Design an enzyme around this catalytic site. Structure first.
Site, short mmCIF file in Angstrom:
data_model
loop_
_atom_site.label_atom_id
_atom_site.label_comp_id
_atom_site.label_asym_id
_atom_site.label_seq_id
_atom_site.Cartn_x
_atom_site.Cartn_y
_atom_site.Cartn_z
N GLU A 22 14.96 -0.34 -9.34
CA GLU A 22 14.11 -0.79 -8.86
C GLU A 22 13.96 -0.26 -7.51
OE1 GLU A 22 13.23 -2.15 -12.66
OE2 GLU A 22 11.79 -0.89 -10.69
N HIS A 61 8.93 1.92 -30.84
CA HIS A 61 8.37 3.44 -29.65
C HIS A 61 7.26 3.74 -31.47
CE1 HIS A 61 11.12 1.96 -27.05
NE2 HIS A 61 10.94 3.75 -26.48
ZN ZN Z 1 13.67 1.80 -14.08
#
Ligand code: ZN
Ligand SMILES: *[C@@H]1O[C@H](CO)[C@@H](O[C@@H]2O[C@H](CO)[C@@H](O)[C@H](O)[C@H]2NC(C)=O)[C@H](O)[C@H]1NC(C)=O
Ligand code: NAG
Ligand code: NAG
Ligand code: NAG
Ligand code: NAG
Ligand code: NAG
Ligand code: NAG
Ligand code: NAG
Lengths: 588, 251
Positions: A350, A480
């Site tokens: 992150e 998806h």
């Molecule tokens: Zn990521």
């Protein structure tokens, strides 16, 4: 006056309104994501409505400038990214039918009743750990016979509507509209077609096939012991034994297929528990790794505004690890950090997304994004790839100093990574070649299930345990496929993930194999990376790639180099067993 | 030299530097303010060492010499901008601020002072009071103010006096919030300017004066001018305090 000079004025007027409406919407979305209460949903919807109506009208305005006169090639990109009609080109009547279809598909997948068991964590836990041949067959067939059965008629209308919408916008089919992200035009020598993506996706997979065939024969030969007389040495792996409901990741197969069982891995949870890491030190260590590779520090407002620990039971918030860039110089990270090595890795992942978002803050509003869709996650992954090597944890206080490493550990490690990385490439390639074939119209409406299970056996080597007729819809089960997302971003993320790592390991003057290369304390590599993080989307992705690796196209050679010791060990292990498979043997 | 004398005007009134810097309401950048401070003895060292300033730079004047110098007038121009555009407040710079809002000449004799003011003039939901000009036909001559609201006719069609397509209103309003970055946070800027003319000095200080002696070869400091010579009653330097004319002859 001239269209180019009047366009530069229109965009100067645009960016100023846009920055403020975007930040006003991001703040209202953060407020609900951290305070999951009432009244916040209404502000979320209002701030997401004003942005949408303002962007719709500003896009209607953008059309009035013809795009042939503009020659700058920057205003060309902003006006290209603004002049797209999207779905409004469809008539009024069928736009609500299409949005109804989308809503129904998402609802029919999210709330699936198998009896009563839902998906999370009802069927997922059965599929991931049952290790019983028939229990996992019931848990597989039930989903494929309910959630895939209720989505059959709808996907036939979703295909034709999306196809006509893509045909109206001057593309050939919806597959071309998806493929159009990897397109560069007008820059001589760097051009890229939408027919070029189908190629290179084939001349890169036909180059990784041997490692997958040896990994497959090793997994099958180690899976024959568990389920005694259900798998055959010549035949393929049935679909319910691959350690996942969709057989997407083979990671759950690592509990069985351990090369060297006795030796453990570098689990350092106890080392951080012993020294009492307070769920904030982890991010400081991440910041110091980035500071040492050469990039700038964290902004101050990150430390005060961001939420880095679950507020408790009094305040509930959904906390899936995320990095927020709200514009106007405001950055935040949303994670429920807990003392575990997993959160020590995700913190660097992150933080690498946050460090990618700070680089291109100087660019205009429409060019504040990654070079193409497969660039943010490669950047976020190579940092978690370097911050995991034992040398780095040895540099940090934990991982007690002596800890000499042997090869028998590095094979355990490599195989635990291979099941995750080189096991999902033939599934991504097969799924995204099926959807391209169906959208183009190559597969008639009476061959949707008959051709899927002929792609499976020839590409993924996975047979079905009960034959499915034409009525079923197997691919619509995947998240998806039903929720209308692209899928080729995960085939290119993996390749970029290792070409970046080879180029930056070379620039650090490391000597030896790549699986234990580290980047910290190497300013030159950090400057090499920041020379491409800075561009943003303003430059073609082939030029952005050439600034780091040195090529204008994606390759698979570094990925193969990373796995060379594993490949040799597997090439020696399998010689007693078979290699490759056969399409005839079916369990039924 | 037998003895050293410094002669300065006898004016002991402090300059209103507490009113420009601690002003209650600072003014929008597009219509900035100007205050002329005259007939005053003004200390700058305490201003220099206040240490609350993000940027304190001077041009054409040394930072410490200005403590004891004589100018004819001093001006002070006070406004508010974002943090990132403070760089444009300098001679020979370009941008949306130094082209259409506030233009400085190259031969600048003043001092630029800027300090963050997030606490005072930002609030939750936005502080949309501070407008700035965004579109102008031509660049601003040094120290000129255009506060008109002419509708920018950006293309070819006559705009008739109403906005819409290709007719843009040229004033756009800054958006300040407390959670923004450093680059988007409100800095208050005060630009001092020092001008000198033939007129009798009016901003001189602080520095105590001494007695006046004649018929010896002495060192003298009149209104910041330095010299060594015999001063004689009448190359001819007027005494500031009594407004006499005193000649000069080398010893
Ligand atoms: Zn990521
Ligand atoms: C990068 O260089 C720094 C030097 O500042 C290394 O930091 C040292 O690490 C050792 C290992 O525990 C400590 O004993 C030292 O006290 C640290 N500081 C100094 C000044 O030596 C850092 O380990 C290096 N990075 C790597 C990956 O080794
Ligand atoms: C969360 O929302 C409620 C609803 O009014 C509010 O009272 C509470 O203060 C909010 N939480 C925080 C931390 O402000
Ligand atoms: C396009 O315009 C920008 C300013 O809007 C300018 O900086 C850039 O150099 C222009 N492109 C070319 C090729 O001159
Ligand atoms: C969007 O629709 C309008 C309607 O006439 C059309 O003129 C325009 O060319 C369309 N945009 C694109 C990119 O085709
Ligand atoms: C920036 O990082 C350097 C290197 O660690 C440090 O010395 C400095 O204090 C940091 N500054 C800020 C504002 O974080
Ligand atoms: C390396 O790994 C192999 C794999 O079984 C093992 O036999 C060998 O003892 C290990 N060490 C060396 C020095 O080869
Ligand atoms: C302005 O106000 C501050 C705070 O009261 C004070 O310390 C300062 O002397 C005042 N004047 C100037 C010129 O800063
Ligand atoms: C102060 O200066 C004035 C100048 O006009 C002079 O008339 C006056 O006598 C002076 N006062 C003194 C020197 O005490």
């Amino acid at each position: 006056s001239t269209i180019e000079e009047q366009a530069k004025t229109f965009l100067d007027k645009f960016n100023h309104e846009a920055e403020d409406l975007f930040y006003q919407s991001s703040l209202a979305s953060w407020n609900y994501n951290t305070n999951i209460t009432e009244e916040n949903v209404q502000n979320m919807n209002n701030a997401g409505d004003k942005w949408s109506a303002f962007l719709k009208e500003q896009s209607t305005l953008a059309q009035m400038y013809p795009l042939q006169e503009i020659q700058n090639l920057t205003v060309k990109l902003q006006l290209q990214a603004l002049q797209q009609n999207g779905s409004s080109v469809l008539s009024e009547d069928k736009s609500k039918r299409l949005n109804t279809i989308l809503n129904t598909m998402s609802t029919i997948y999210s709330t699936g009743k198998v009896c009563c068991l839902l998906l999370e964590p009802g069927l997922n836990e059965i599929m991931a750990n049952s290790l019983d041949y028939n229990e996992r067959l019931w848990a597989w067939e039930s989903w494929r016979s309910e959630v895939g059965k209720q989505l059959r008629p709808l996907y036939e209308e979703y295909v034709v509507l999306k196809n006509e919408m893509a045909r109206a916008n001057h593309y050939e089919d919806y597959g071309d509209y998806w493929r159009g992200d990897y397109e560069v035009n007008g820059v001589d020598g760097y051009d890229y077609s939408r027919g070029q993506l189908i190629e290179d996706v084939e001349h890169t997979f036909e180059e990784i096939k041997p490692l997958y065939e040896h990994l497959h024969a090793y997994v099958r030969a180690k899976l024959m012991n568990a389920y005694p007389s259900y798998i055959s040495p010549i035949g393929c792996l049935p679909a319910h034994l691959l350690g996942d409901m969709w057989g997407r990741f083979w990671t759950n197969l690592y509990s069985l297929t351990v090369p060297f069982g006795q030796k453990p891995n570098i689990d350092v949870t106890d080392a951080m528990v012993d020294q009492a890491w307070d769920a904030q030190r982890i991010f400081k260590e991440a910041e110091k790794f980035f500071v040492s590779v050469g990039l700038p520090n964290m902004t101050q407002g990150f430390w005060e505004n961001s939420m880095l620990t679950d507020p408790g039971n009094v305040q509930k918030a959904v906390c899936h690890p995320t990095a927020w860039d709200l514009g106007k110089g405001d950055f935040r990270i949303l994670m429920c950090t807990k003392v575990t090595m997993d959160d020590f890795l995700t913190a660097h992942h992150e933080m690498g997304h946050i460090q990618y978002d700070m680089a291109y803050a100087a660019q205009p509003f429409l060019l504040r994004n990654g070079a193409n869709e497969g660039f943010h996650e490669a950047v976020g992954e190579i940092m978690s790839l370097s911050a995991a090597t034992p040398k780095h944890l040895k540099s940090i206080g934990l991982l007690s100093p002596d800890f000499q490493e042997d090869n028998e550990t590095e094979i355990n490690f490599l195989l635990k990574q291979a099941l995750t990385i080189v096991g999902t490439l033939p599934f991504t390639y097969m799924l995204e070649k099926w959807r391209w074939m169906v959208f183009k119209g190559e597969i008639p409406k009476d061959q949707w299930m008959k051709k899927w299970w002929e792609m499976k056996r020839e590409i993924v080597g996975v047979v079905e345990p009960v034959p499915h007729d034409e009525t079923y819809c197997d691919p619509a089960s995947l998240f998806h496929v039903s929720n209308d997302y692209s899928f080729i971003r995960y085939y290119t993320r993996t390749l970029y993930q290792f070409q970046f790592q080879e180029a930056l390991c070379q620039a650090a003057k490391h000597e030896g194999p790549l699986h234990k290369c580290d980047i910290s304390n190497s300013t030159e590599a950090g400057q090499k990376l920041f020379n491409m993080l800075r561009l943003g989307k303003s430059e073609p992705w082939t030029l952005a790639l050439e600034n780091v690796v040195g090529a204008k196209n994606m390759n698979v050679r570094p990925l193969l180099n990373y796995f060379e010791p594993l490949f040799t060990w597997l090439k020696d292990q399998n010689k007693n067993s078979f290699v490759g498979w056969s399409t005839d043997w079916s369990p039924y | 030299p037998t003895e050293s004398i410094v002669r300065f005007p006898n004016i002991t009134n402090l300059c209103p530097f507490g009113e420009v810097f601690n002003a209650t309401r600072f003014a929008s950048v597009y219509a900035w303010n100007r205050k002329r401070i005259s007939n005053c003895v003004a200390d700058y060292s305490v201003l220099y060492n206040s240490a609350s300033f993000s940027t304190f730079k001077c041009y054409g004047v040394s930072p410490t010499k200005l403590n004891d110098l004589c100018f004819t007038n001093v001006y002070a121009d006070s406004f508010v901008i974002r943090g990132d555009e403070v760089r444009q407040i300098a001679p020979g710079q370009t941008g949306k601020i130094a082209d259409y809002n506030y233009k400085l000449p190259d031969d600048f004799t003043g001092c630029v002072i800027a300090w963050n003011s997030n606490n005072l003039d930002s609030k939750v939901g936005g502080n949309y009071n501070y407008l700035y000009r965004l579109f102008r036909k031509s660049n601003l001559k040094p120290f000129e103010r255009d506060i008109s609201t002419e509708i920018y006719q950006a293309g070819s069609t006559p705009c008739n006096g109403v906005e819409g397509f290709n007719c843009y209103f040229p004033l756009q309003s800054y958006g300040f919030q407390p959670t923004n970055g450093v680059g988007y946070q409100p800095y208050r800027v005060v630009v001092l300017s020092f001008e000198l003319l033939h007129a009798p000095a009016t901003v001189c200080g602080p520095k105590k004066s001494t007695n006046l002696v004649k018929n010896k070869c002495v060192n003298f400091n009149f209104n910041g001018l330095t010299g060594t010579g015999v001063l004689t009653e009448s190359d001819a330097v007027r005494d500031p305090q009594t407004l006499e004319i005193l000649d000069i002859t080398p010893c």
